[PDB]
């Protein structure tokens, strides 16, 4: 199935769990392409599954600054595999 604007998005977000899915949604909000003198976003997050972080991130931004910033946020953690899979022409494997 396709999504609101995700489909396969939540499949990437099925591999990882709180062990670094939390760090992902965290590191994101620090990087947060605004850049201003706080380095957070307003309204506390409430979304725990990868699916939920999907429909969350498209709300925060849209497809664009969701995924474009996501592909940075894996540079922070060190998920070169994800940054590969996301671009591999493959839709995971």
UniProtKB/Swiss-Prot annotation:
Domain of life: Eukaryota
Modified residues (Phosphoserine): 93
Induction behaviour: Up-regulated by ATF4 during endoplasmic reticulum (ER) stress response. Up-regulated in arterial endothelial cells exposed to plasma from patients with peripheral arterial disease, but not to plasma from healthy controls.
Residue ranges constituting the Pyrin domain according to the UniProt record: 1-92
Effect of residue 76 to A: No effect on cleavage by HRV-14 Protease 3C
Post-translational modification: Phosphorylated by MAP3K20 isoform ZAKalpha, MAPK11 and MAPK14 in response to UV-B irradiation and ribosome collisions, promoting activation of the NLRP1 inflammasome and pyroptosis.
Tissue-level expression: Widely expressed. Abundantly expressed in primary immune cells (isoform 1 and isoform 2), including in neutrophils, monocytes/macrophages, dendritic cells (mostly Langerhans cells), and B- and T-lymphocytes (at protein level). Strongly expressed in epithelial cells lining the glandular epithelium, such as that of the gastrointestinal tract (stomach, small intestine, colon), the respiratory tract (trachea and bronchi), and the endometrial and endocervical glands, gallbladder, prostate, and breast (at protein level).
Localization of this protein: Cytoplasm, Cytosol; Cytoplasm; Nucleus
Transmembrane domains' residue ranges: none
Domain comment in the entry: The CARD domain, rather than the pyrin domain, is involved in the interaction with PYCARD, CASP1 and CASP5. The ZAKalpha motifs are recognized and phosphorylated by isoform ZAKalpha of MAP3K20.
Disease: Vitiligo-associated multiple autoimmune disease 1: A disorder characterized by the association of vitiligo with several autoimmune and autoinflammatory diseases including autoimmune thyroid disease, rheumatoid arthritis and systemic lupus erythematosus.
Additional notes on this entry: In macrophages and dendritic cells, NLRP1 inflammasome activation of CASP1 and IL1B maturation can be dampened by direct contact with activated effector and memory T-cells. This effect may be mediated by hexameric TNF ligands, such as CD40LG.
Family: Belongs to the NLRP family.
Known partners and oligomeric status: Interacts (via LRR repeats) with BCL2 and BCL2L1 (via the loop between motifs BH4 and BH3); these interactions reduce NLRP1 inflammasome-induced CASP1 activation and IL1B release, possibly by impairing NLRP1 interaction with PYCARD. Interacts with NOD2; this interaction is enhanced in the presence of muramyl dipeptide (MDP) and increases IL1B release. Interacts with EIF2AK2/PKR; this interaction requires EIF2AK2 activity, is accompanied by EIF2AK2 autophosphorylation and promotes inflammasome assembly in response to danger-associated signals. (Microbial infection) Interacts with vaccinia virus protein F1.
Function: Acts as the sensor component of the NLRP1 inflammasome, which mediates inflammasome activation in response to various pathogen-associated signals, leading to subsequent pyroptosis. Inflammasomes are supramolecular complexes that assemble in the cytosol in response to pathogens and other damage-associated signals and play critical roles in innate immunity and inflammation.
The protein, known as: NACHT, LRR and PYD domains-containing protein 1
Species this chain originates from: Homo sapiens (Human)
């Amino acid at each position: 199935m396709a999504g609101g604007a995700w489909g396969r998005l939540a499949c990437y977000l099925e591999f990882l769990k709180k062990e670094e899915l939390k760090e992902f949604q965290l590191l994101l909000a620090n990087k947060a392409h605004s850049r201003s003198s706080s380095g957070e976003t307003p309204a506390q997050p409430e979304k725990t599954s990868g699916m939920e972080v999907a429909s969350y991130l498209v709300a925060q931004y849209g497809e664009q600054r969701a995924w474009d910033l996501a592909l940075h946020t894996w540079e922070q953690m060190g998920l070169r595999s994800l940054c590969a899979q996301a671009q591999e022409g493959a839709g995971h494997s």
